[PDB]
Amino acid sequence: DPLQQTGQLFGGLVRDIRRRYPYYLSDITDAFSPQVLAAVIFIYFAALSPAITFGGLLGEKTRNQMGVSELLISTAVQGILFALLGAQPLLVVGFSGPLLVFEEAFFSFCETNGLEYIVGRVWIGFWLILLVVLVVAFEGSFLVRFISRYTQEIFSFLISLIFIYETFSKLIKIFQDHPLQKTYNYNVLMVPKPQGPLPNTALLSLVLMAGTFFFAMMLRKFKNSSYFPGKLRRVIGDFGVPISILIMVLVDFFIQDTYTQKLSVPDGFKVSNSSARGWVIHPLGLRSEFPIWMMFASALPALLVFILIFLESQITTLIVSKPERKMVKGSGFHLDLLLVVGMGGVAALFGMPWLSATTVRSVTHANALTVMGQIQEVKEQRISGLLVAVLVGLSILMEPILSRIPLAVLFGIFLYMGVTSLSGIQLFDRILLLFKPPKYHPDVPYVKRVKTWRMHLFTGIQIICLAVLWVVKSTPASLALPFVLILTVPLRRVLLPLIFRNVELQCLDAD
Amino acid sequence: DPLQQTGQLFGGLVRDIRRRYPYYLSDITDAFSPQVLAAVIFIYFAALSPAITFGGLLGEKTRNQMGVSELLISTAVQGILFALLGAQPLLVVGFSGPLLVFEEAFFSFCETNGLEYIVGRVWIGFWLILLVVLVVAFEGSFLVRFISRYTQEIFSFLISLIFIYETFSKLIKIFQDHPLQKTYNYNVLMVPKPQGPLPNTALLSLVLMAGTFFFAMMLRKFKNSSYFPGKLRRVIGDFGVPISILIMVLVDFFIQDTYTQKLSVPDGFKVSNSSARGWVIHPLGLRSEFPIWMMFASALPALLVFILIFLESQITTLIVSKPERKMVKGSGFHLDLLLVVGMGGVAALFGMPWLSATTVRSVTHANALTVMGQIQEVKEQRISGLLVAVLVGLSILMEPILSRIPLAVLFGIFLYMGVTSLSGIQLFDRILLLFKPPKYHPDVPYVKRVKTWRMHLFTGIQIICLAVLWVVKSTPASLALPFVLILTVPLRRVLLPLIFRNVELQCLDAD
Numbered sequence A, B: 001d002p003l004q005q006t007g008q009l010f011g012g013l014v015r016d017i018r019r020r021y022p023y024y025l026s027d028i029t030d031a032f033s034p035q036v037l038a039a040v041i042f043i044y045f046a047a048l049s050p051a052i053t054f055g056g057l058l059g060e061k062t063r064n065q066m067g068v069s070e071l072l073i074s075t076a077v078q079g080i081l082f083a084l085l086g087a088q089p090l091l092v093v094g095f096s097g098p099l100l101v102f103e104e105a106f107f108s109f110c111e112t113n114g115l116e117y118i119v120g121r122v123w124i125g126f127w128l129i130l131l132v133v134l135v136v137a138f139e140g141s142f143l144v145r146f147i148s149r150y151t152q153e154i155f156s157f158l159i160s161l162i163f164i165y166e167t168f169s170k171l172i173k174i175f176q177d178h179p180l181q182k183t184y185n186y187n188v189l190m191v192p193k194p195q196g197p198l199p200n201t202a203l204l205s206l207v208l209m210a211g212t213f214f215f216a217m218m219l220r221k222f223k224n225s226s227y228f229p230g231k232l233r234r235v236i237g238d239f240g241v242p243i244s245i246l247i248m249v250l251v252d253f254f255i256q257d258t259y260t261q262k263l264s265v266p267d268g269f270k271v272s273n274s275s276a277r278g279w280v281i282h283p284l285g286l287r288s289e290f291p292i293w294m295m296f297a298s299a300l301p302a303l304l305v306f307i308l309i310f311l312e313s314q315i316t317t318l319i320v321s322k323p324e325r326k327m328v329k330g331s332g333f334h335l336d337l338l339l340v341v342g343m344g345g346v347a348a349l350f351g352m353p354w355l356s357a358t359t360v361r362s363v364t365h366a367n368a369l370t371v372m373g374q375i376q377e378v379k380e381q382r383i384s385g386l387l388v389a390v391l392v393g394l395s396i397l398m399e400p401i402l403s404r405i406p407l408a409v410l411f412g413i414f415l416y417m418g419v420t421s422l423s424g425i426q427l428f429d430r431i432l433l434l435f436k437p438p439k440y441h442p443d444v445p446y447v448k449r450v451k452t453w454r455m456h457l458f459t460g461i462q463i464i465c466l467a468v469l470w471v472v473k474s475t476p477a478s479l480a481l482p483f484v485l486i487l488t489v490p491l492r493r494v495l496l497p498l499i500f501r502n503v504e505l506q507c508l509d510a511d
């Protein structure tokens, strides 16, 4: 019903508003639960740490044009606004890898042509605002109807694998920075960072990450396990991630001689490069007048950004708001798209980065708010997102608290997040079934109705698509990764029916 | 009933021989299976490493009169003989902690008096031979019929807890030897051992132990899991411990710079202190004449040693040969005791330690040879024990391979061994049930036929007994630890019926 084309202009937006806004008092009053607070802390850490990392990276690639502080402010403000007004408050808006790739590419292009980067970002944001207004006007979001379970599952599996690979690559980098050596230099300098290898740092980081992951898994099992009174067991289980974070933070705190990398938040809310840019960015130019040719040619990068943000946000909303996840309040596609893209453009006007609804963190938020009885229900409320965004904004004032948080603890939390995000995806189920004998296959329609080798061939085609997407991402043509993902949609609709019969597709791919 | 008293002298011995010896060809031919080889490797490592540790300890306490070479030779010879002739080949003989404490105490007493310690040992061995001959003549082993599930369970739980605590204490020791410090000395000497703290050694040892335990658990779960073809999955499951050992050994091998403690085996078969003692020890004395007062007073410490060895070996045989473990070939309670004590006394003649049937290693051997369908059957054969003893004897010739083996890998293997030995003990099941709500209690007679609080009180009484045994063991009066264990037998027979009704005891304690 929400994904339907109507003759009235902006019909999807008003339909989404009329569907969601009646439940506003229900969302406000539904946050009174310990599970909500536990998910608040979990999502706060899982949104601050990637935000810190992406801000540091963005400050590194650019000449500090956009760094940690601007990313934090943008994330906080956009999260507050999206939680307050969005049709699906369970979504969390944050910076993503493809966005960083585009930002570095645009900065390189601007340096090559000598134009101002941030003013180009402002004009791209204006183009994005125009594009999203037109798309919502013409009900373009209905196109996500053609995104079936095939594309959603491929995207979710690839993105979770990317999260796991990023965590493991960070661990490998922390090992390479401090190699296991017989001897090390003494009285090293750590003012910006350790200039040389350090003893016990890599092994302690690995130990902390593994311990955090193990404790998260143990608490997740204990939540379903029947070793304690039901109320106490559920309260401890839903607080599992904060418990693991607290335990590992205390463990690292009680170690005084060894050095482990901690979260670094800036002192005060200010621009990363005060001399380079101000709070408000002039659309005509801070130093040189903006040529009209870029004013009119910003559409193509803006078109690419809109395609990336729209595809990622809408596929993430489709994944989160599936009927199998027991979401009864409904979700709005047009309103969410308008909000995310328009606020991204407005943030680009203020010099802050634009953001899209990330997949791993939104799925993790939904899973944390999911109440298990089989999924009995999902706590859908805006207070969780509002509090997460408020805490992200206030993370600057909480420097003593975040200074004690090791990065390896968050690496373990990210590994756990990716692994549990892998759960619930039938593509992962077929991956597991690839190794099981045909006797042990579960009683599901896509096992009885279809032969085992046909289902294995379907899973092999999905694996081939995943490998192609991974190769594209590793290729410096990473911005084309969404587009080839779009190429998955015709494959299901055109090429797949040539191979598999109608009943095989309807059983294997179904809403 | 094999465990009964008959009119004929040496009745138990002849009954056990006439029972077990017919199946000799069956034991010889029953070893043709990959599970047998995997258990051979597992038990070989799990018997060599404790033997090496105990030999090093014995060299430390004594003036190298008793060392690791004598311990290895005695263990190998006695294992070969027991596997060839014993009525329960699945039993593995080895040194134990109580034996260490007695040897240290006897050496201290002999030094304080001033006579030769090893000649006292050989006289103790002669007294042991006389005592075991008399006991088997009078069929004293039937007294273990008084030992019920109560005492066996308490002993097994305490011994498994002791194994786990020893592994964790070893980990704490290797952490304390190399503290996590900001700086370390350089050009450290490691000719006998590291003379100072070393970087990354403690953390790498912890990582190796945790990884070995994790891999062992993952392969143990995979053995019963539904993945992979059944034959291949089972074959990998039996070889789980060797696979974990190999993986961790390779991981440590590929780390050149960092130092981890390895197994240390002697070069050649020779006495630890050539000047102090020879291979054959003269019963009247090597340098100082042996007074007759010790000649006739050696019985009391020899009686203590016989009580310790007999009690440990018989309870271990009771635990291993329980009917619920599906052992159909039979067991020997009189031939096994005679063999163990007689070869212990003969080893005392040849200047080698006496060895008892260790609990954790025998239970581990039985579990490794156990075929799981519920326990379908147990592979009972002599070739496993014979090969384990032969490899222990040949450990000297395999110096490079063992030098490549780290000690943290074996610590993780010991942790896995203790945890797996904890399984199958109903006392541990009631410990787990202490936390579960009454609804989730399993379907066993001691849940319905007895109230929840009565069963909890029974488990609390067993907990108090365990605490008393632990306190006694930590107390320097460790030699009394078996004796107070015997005190559990009257408590079940006399004090317990005062509190619990007959039906409660018959349900909670049953064979």
Ligand SMILES: *[C@@H]1O[C@H](CO)[C@@H](O)[C@H](O)[C@H]1NC(C)=O
Pocket (backbone or CB within 6 Å): A062, A063, A064, A273, A275, A276
């Ligand atoms: C800040 O911007 C200037 C140009 O105004 C640039 O040269 C400088 O490198 C930037 N700061 C840092 C720390 O990179």
Ligand SMILES: *[C@@H]1O[C@H](CO)[C@@H](O)[C@H](O)[C@H]1NC(C)=O
Pocket (backbone or CB within 6 Å): B063, B064, B065, B272, B273, B275, B276
């Ligand atoms: C061997 O015995 C002698 C007796 O004089 C003693 O001093 C020495 O410590 C012992 N150990 C070694 C390794 O020589």
